[PDB]
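Long-time lurker, finally posting.

We've been working with Protein spire homolog 1 (Homo sapiens) and I want a structural starting point before designing mutants. I don't trust myself to interpret raw outputs, so I'm hoping someone here can both generate the structure tokens and explain anything notable. Sequence follows.
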Amino acid sequence: DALSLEEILRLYNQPINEEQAWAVCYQCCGSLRAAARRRQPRHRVRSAAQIRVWRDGAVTLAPAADQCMETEVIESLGIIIYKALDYGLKENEERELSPPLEQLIDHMANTVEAIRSYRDVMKLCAAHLPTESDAPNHYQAVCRALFAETMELH
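Top reply, 14 upvotes:
Generated this for you. Predicted structure of Protein spire homolog 1:
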């Protein structure tokens, strides 16, 4: 009923595509934003195991095998996302990321030459679309589908 992003990465044994990153990012903060709104303990994104992907097409961060501020969660999330977008490459090689995406990840994880809150992140994910107002439906579908298609592999 929910696949961890790490299960999805093992079954396909390949990286998520750009869009899927944009999705997981949006979906995921959207869940974090709505958990801080109920004032819930903030968890760091340790590994892609914690990123539960839902049938209905939500993405929610789990608590890890185990203070800490918002900007930190954003960052640790951005990192897993990079790492996922990275699956199965060696050291010498890194993936050509489409600039607005590099630019998103670099900003979430502090790798640049602003973004202080989950909200900020979504405004950016949503900016990636031809119509800004489409985000919450598109990024559902996208994830909804990444679940469906992964269950087809079993």
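Before you design anything, note these points.
The first strand starts at residue 2 and ends at 4.
The two ends are 12 Å apart (CA to CA).
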